[PDB]
Amino acid sequence: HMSYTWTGALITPCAAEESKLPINALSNSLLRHHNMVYATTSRSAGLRQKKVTFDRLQVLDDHYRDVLKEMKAKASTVKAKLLSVEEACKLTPPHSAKSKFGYGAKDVRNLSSKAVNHIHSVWKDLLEDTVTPIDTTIMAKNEVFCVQRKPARLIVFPDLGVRVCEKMALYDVVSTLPQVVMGSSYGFQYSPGQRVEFLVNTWKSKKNPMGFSYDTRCFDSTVTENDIRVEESIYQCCDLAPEARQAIKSLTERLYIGGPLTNSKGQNCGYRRCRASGVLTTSCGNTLTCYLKASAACRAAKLQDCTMLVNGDDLVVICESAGTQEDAASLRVFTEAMTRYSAPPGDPPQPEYDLELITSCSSNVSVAHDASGKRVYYLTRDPTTPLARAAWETARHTPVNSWLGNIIMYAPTLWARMILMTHFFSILLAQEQLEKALDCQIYGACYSIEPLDLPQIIERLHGLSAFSLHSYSPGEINRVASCLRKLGVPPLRVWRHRARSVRARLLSQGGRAATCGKYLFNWAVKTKLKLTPIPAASRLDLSGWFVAGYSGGDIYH
Numbered sequence: 351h352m353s354y355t356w357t358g359a360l361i362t363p364c365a366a367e368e369s370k371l372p373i374n375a376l377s378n379s380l381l382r383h384h385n386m387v388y389a390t391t392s393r394s395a396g397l398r399q400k401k402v403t404f405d406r407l408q409v410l411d412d413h414y415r416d417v418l419k420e421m422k423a424k425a426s427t428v429k430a431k432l433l434s435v436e437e438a439c440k441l442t443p444p445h446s447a448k449s450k451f452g453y454g455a456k457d458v459r460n461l462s463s464k465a466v467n468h469i470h471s472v473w474k475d476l477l478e479d480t481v482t483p484i485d486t487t488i489m490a491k492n493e494v495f496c497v498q499r500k501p502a503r504l505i506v507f508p509d510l511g512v513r514v515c516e517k518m519a520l521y522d523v524v525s526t527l528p529q530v531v532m533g534s535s536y537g538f539q540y541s542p543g544q545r546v547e548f549l550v551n552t553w554k555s556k557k558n559p560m561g562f563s564y565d566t567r568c569f570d571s572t573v574t575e576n577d578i579r580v581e582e583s584i585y586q587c588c589d590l591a592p593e594a595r596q597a598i599k600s601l602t603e604r605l606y607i608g609g610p611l612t613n614s615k616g617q618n619c620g621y622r623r624c625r626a627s628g629v630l631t632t633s634c635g636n637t638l639t640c641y642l643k644a645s646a647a648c649r650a651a652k653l654q655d656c657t658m659l660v661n662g663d664d665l666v667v668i669c670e671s672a673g674t675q676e677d678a679a680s681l682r683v684f685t686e687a688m689t690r691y692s693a694p695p696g697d698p699p700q701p702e703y704d705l706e707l708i709t710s711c712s713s714n715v716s717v718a719h720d721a722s723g724k725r726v727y728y729l730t731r732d733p734t735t736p737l738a739r740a741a742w743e744t745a746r747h748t749p750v751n752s753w754l755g756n757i758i759m760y761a762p763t764l765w766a767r768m769i770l771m772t773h774f775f776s777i778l779l780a781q782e783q784l785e786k787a788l789d790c791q792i793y794g795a796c797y798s799i800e801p802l803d804l805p806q807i808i809e810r811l812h813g814l815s816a817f818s819l820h821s822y823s824p825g826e827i828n829r830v831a832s833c834l835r836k837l838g839v840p841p842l843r844v845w846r847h848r849a850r851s852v853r854a855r856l857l858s859q860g861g862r863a864a865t866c867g868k869y870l871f872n873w874a875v876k877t878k879l880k881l882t883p884i885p886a887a888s889r890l891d892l893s894g895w896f897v898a899g900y901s902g903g904d905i906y907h
């Protein structure tokens with residue numbers, strides 16, 4: 351029961367790949383230690399192939415089936431609708447990979463007759479054929495990291511026509527079912543503000559709180575055929591149109607369970623029998639399966655008063671402590687159970703008794719003070735990776751502007767405000783690109799966002815205090831300064847100086863640019879303004895935001 355089998359054909363690139371950090375006239379203003387930053391390339395795909403390839407054994411017990419039964423009960427309450435071809439098309443990102451059958455993403459988005467004709471013929475084939483494996487492409491991802499080198503992650507995805515069909519059959523399901531089945535434990539429903547609030551309240555709810563994150567080693571490759579059939583049975587609990595049921599059976603049999611793996615040059619690379627990382631159901635499937643296995647493992651480990659927070663395979667548990675030594679033993683049994691369920695650990699879970707020492711979705715809780723001196727909890731992270739990616743993005747336009755994603759989700763943090771906002775607004779002013787819409791990915795979905803709308807977006811996800819936090823914690827200040835020394839990033843005093851300039855330059859522009867000056871950089875001046883609610887923030891359609899996760903799912907808003 352191997353996760354993959356291979357032919358020896360290489361996982362090839364589409365385009366030229368750079369691994370070394372590109373340097374331009376802006377690079378040194380952000381980061382001097384250039385040799386510490388690299389991008390992954392297809393050249394490391396062979397090592398990843400080794401890592402993701404292993405035998406899965408699964409031992410399923412009554413705790414597993416009990417939880418599953420409970421999950422299906424909740425799933426039966428869901429009604430989902432089929433999308434029209436045209437609805438599905440409009441959810442397609444403008445730069446999504448083109449079909450093999452003579453059309454591309456902009457063809458799909460424009461409802462070009464050729465595209466829509468192909469999609470109708472794909473749909474009809476799903477309805478008629480529930481057996482034939484569907485072809486997928488396997489590609490190496492190019493992502494940027496700091497040293498101390500990771501091999502490239504793999505992405506496996508079916509043809510554009512199929513992807514539109516997935517949307518038609520399952521978009522409403524994957525959008526609505528996770529929150530119904532998992533309620534408050536479903537992470538992708540929450541803005542950052544809502545997530546910190548859930549974490550802090552959950553911690554406070556316990557008499558003696560203990561918490562841990564569980565890291566599954568290569569979660570996608572631990573997902574078995576059983577797991578994928580169980581996912582399908584959950585989806586099938588929904589109130590669905592007859593064509594939707596047939597299409598979901600067909601996609602499950604022909605695509606989700608497994609299939610052939612073709613490189614960008616058309617050569618067969620092998621065969622997958624685990625989760626495809628690049629399908630509509632990757633996030634929803636991962637979340638449900640992670641939740642099922644973890645909920646049953648909690649019961650196996652007799653952890654008391656378990657509260658879970660699950661975003662795909664990212665799992666945090668907060669529960670009642672039994673003292674340190676017993677907690678350690680309980681975690682060992684939790685892991686044993688997970689392992690029997692085919693989700694063994696990368697790093698062994700560590701129990702934590704301070705909420706701020708728990709990392710989940712790569713973030714920890716920390717504390718600052720708002721304008722009134724009130725303590726405010728917010729989410730932050732070690733800024734090394736964000737800054738290494740910012741440095742790549744200073745010299746190269748990328749399909750995913752991670753800095754924008756980071757300014758949005760980590761707006762309240764010391765490092766996003768002082769460094770990211772300052773640096774990137776300086777660049778945008780110089781190139782007259784304040785108004786130019788840019789793509790970023792939040793909870794796996796693509797969003798086209800104009801930088802001038804940042805203040806309103808930040809207000810809506812975080813509140814006005816995002817523009818007012820001060821008196822950050824010693825350990826957080828210390829982590830940021832340390833990171834800046836490691837990377838050769840100028841110290842925070844330099845950034846304050848530049849922000850004052852950027853702020854002025856922005857106010858000179860007037861209008862929405864001045865509003866950016868006023869809100870984003872009020873921390874940089876000594877005569878602070880009073881920041882009042884933004885009129886445009888009440889008008890923003892932030893629907894689409896924080897309903898669900900869609901990593902690998904080819905979704906655009």
Ligand SMILES: Cc1cc(CN2C(=O)C(C3=NS(=O)(=O)c4c3ccc3c4CN(S(C)(=O)=O)CC3)=C(O)[C@@H]2C(C)(C)C)ccc1F
Binds near residue numbers: 664901
């Ligand atoms: C303040 C704050 C900051 C973050 C950091 N972020 C993430 O972790 C993801 C994320 N996107 S995803 O859906 O691709 C995904 C994420 C996290 C874990 C996981 C996944 C997706 N999966 S999967 C492949 O199983 O769906 C693995 C687990 C994000 O979009 C943001 C980011 C913009 C800064 C990157 C998160 C919540 C939050 F409140």
